[PDB]
Design a protein around this ligand. Structure first.
Ligand SMILES: Nc1ncnc2c1ncn2[C@@H]1O[C@H](COP(=O)(O)OP(=O)(O)O)[C@@H](O)[C@H]1O
Ligand SMILES: Nc1ncnc2c1ncn2[C@@H]1O[C@H](COP(=O)(O)OP(=O)(O)O)[C@@H](O)[C@H]1O
Ligand SMILES: [Cl-]
Ligand SMILES: [Cl-]
Ligand SMILES: [Mg+2]
Ligand SMILES: [Mg+2]
Ligand SMILES: [Mg+2]
Ligand SMILES: [Mg+2]
Lengths: 283, 283
């Protein structure tokens, strides 16, 4: 190497192997000396994180990753609970795929995580299979949402202040924007729709392989790639929900509440399995 | 009273009479003890200003107010150069009005102030006759733009980062917003158009007196109130420029550059009077 870990980190943790990486951070296995138990440590280079640490510290939901510690050294170190089943992405690449029952169980948890975010005024903005971690290598497991590097605290207070004028001077485009203000969170429901599409079908709804119509043009028209042969194996209920999340109008798009009330999620077997997994954890 | 001035303020300044007030701050005459010269002190109650102080300290233009000092006490105190001719508003109320020659001189300075802001990545967002101060009680004078409480540092870096995905997951409305991103500054050109309309005609373009069409509906349609009798006294050139600033499409709206190149502003007499006023100041 060309470096060492900072002394404050080394004091409390024994660092181990790489668990994963992305465009922002590399994630390492470590052992916490005090408990002798495993953690994950995300390393972020300095070349904000303040806001990501702040958001993470105040969130408390079983389907959202918890922060355990933080170092502000030559790099940033974020100590996290360890997720031993890896990424959701690993379960859906090779155009391969989950059974509908486990898509439902995993998705139900995603909806709850995201619902809880939106209730607390947070938008994730980067929901993707690589940012959904599994608890164990067992198929029926708890998932957690991770990677809050792009997330925002919800607001519109700037618009609300503008509107307390004095419109004599106010530009028309500011007044036009009032029609959709406060629907930022809907980008998360779109992302959820895409993740749900992928989990059910094994393939992405919008993609450059095939087509000729630009990826952009496919997304703004909402003309996802439907392959009947692949969807025949999936219930009508599951597809109906995908359709309601992949609506181009963000005001007409399903919210996490409307998705949780969708017929697909009225599944007592799935919900009982979720509560079962929760109680196991909490010992 | 129910209060005193903070000791740090009193140490350097002798406070005097109220010069003006708004929804945010009350502005007081003061004398700086060290120079025995007059200043204005804006008092802002604590119930941000950091960002307004920061923006003001880095701006250096003859048509923009300068900050001289700052106190962060039970209230905020912003010490400013004193403008002895008051607000532009005072010259245009009572549905009364300026001669076209002085509208031009004052407007030319406004365009320069705003051009300089946009070049430096700042949008004012609250341009109005009450935030344009005159240097003296003489008609031909220097104006300064003031009141940067609503101003923003220009950006889009969030969108630019979103676009460095990974559009597989990206919501259509984010992709739609790319078409107008980076035209925030255009709200200042709209405000300038309205101020110019008022200065030339004595009356506001959008107003609830008369009409029945809602103020909002008038602004978004761009159907300003044109009274021929009032505009007959104004050149065709002046009105043409108003028309180009009061365009509802912010991408087609005149920029401060296009306005400075408008035939109305190709006036060597006006420009010579401006440079004359500048050199007087700078002694
Ligand atoms: N708490 C964790 N437990 C186990 N693996 C993790 C954990 N957090 C992240 N990882 C692995 O590291 C990868 C990158 O983490 P993430 O926070 O998404 O970084 P980035 O901001 O670079 O995308 C993840 O996709 C995952 O594979
Ligand atoms: N530098 C100054 N010199 C003289 N008068 C001033 C000065 N600054 C402000 N004023 C007077 O005080 C009023 C309020 O100041 P401003 O900064 O616009 O406060 P607000 O944020 O409350 O609108 C102005 O409209 C003007 O009449
Ligand atoms: Cl809400
Ligand atoms: Cl530019
Ligand atoms: Mg990630
Ligand atoms: Mg994180
Ligand atoms: Mg003001
Ligand atoms: Mg100010």
């Amino acid at each position: 190497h060309m470096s060492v870990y900072p002394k404050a980190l080394r004091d409390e943790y024994i660092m181990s192997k790489t668990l994963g990486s992305g465009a922002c951070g590399e994630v390492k296995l470590a052992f916490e000396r005090k408990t002798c138990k495993k953690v994950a440590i995300k390393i972020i280079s300095k070349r904000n994180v303040e806001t990501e640490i702040e958001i993470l510290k105040k969130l408390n939901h079983p389907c959202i990753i918890k922060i355990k510690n933080f170092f502000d050294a030559e790099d940033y170190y974020i100590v996290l609970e360890l997720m031993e089943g890896g990424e959701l992405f690993d379960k859906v690449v090779g155009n391969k795929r989950l059974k509908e029952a486990t898509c439902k169980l995993y998705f139900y948890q995603m909806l709850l995580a995201v619902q809880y975010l939106h209730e607390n005024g947070i938008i994730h903005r980067d929901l993707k299979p690589e940012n959904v971690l599994l608890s164990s290598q067992e198929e029926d497991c708890l998932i957690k949402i991770t990677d809050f590097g792009h997330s925002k605290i919800l607001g519109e207070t700037s618009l609300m202040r503008t509107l307390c004028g004095t419109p004599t001077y106010l530009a028309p485009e500011v007044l036009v924007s009032v029609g959709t203000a406060g629907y930022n969170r809907a980008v998360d429901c779109w992302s959820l729709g895409v993740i749900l599409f992928i989990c059910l079908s094994g393939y992405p709804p919008f993609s450059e392989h095939r087509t000729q119509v630009s990826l952009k043009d496919q997304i703004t028209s909402g003309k996802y790639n439907f392959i009947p042969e692949v969807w025949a194996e999936v219930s009508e209920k599951a597809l109906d929900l995908v359709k309601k999340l992949l609506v181009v109008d963000p005001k007409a798009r399903f919210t996490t509440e409307e998705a949780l009330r969708h017929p697909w999620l009225q599944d007592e077997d799935m919900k009982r399995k979720f509560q079962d997994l929760l109680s196991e954890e909490n010992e």
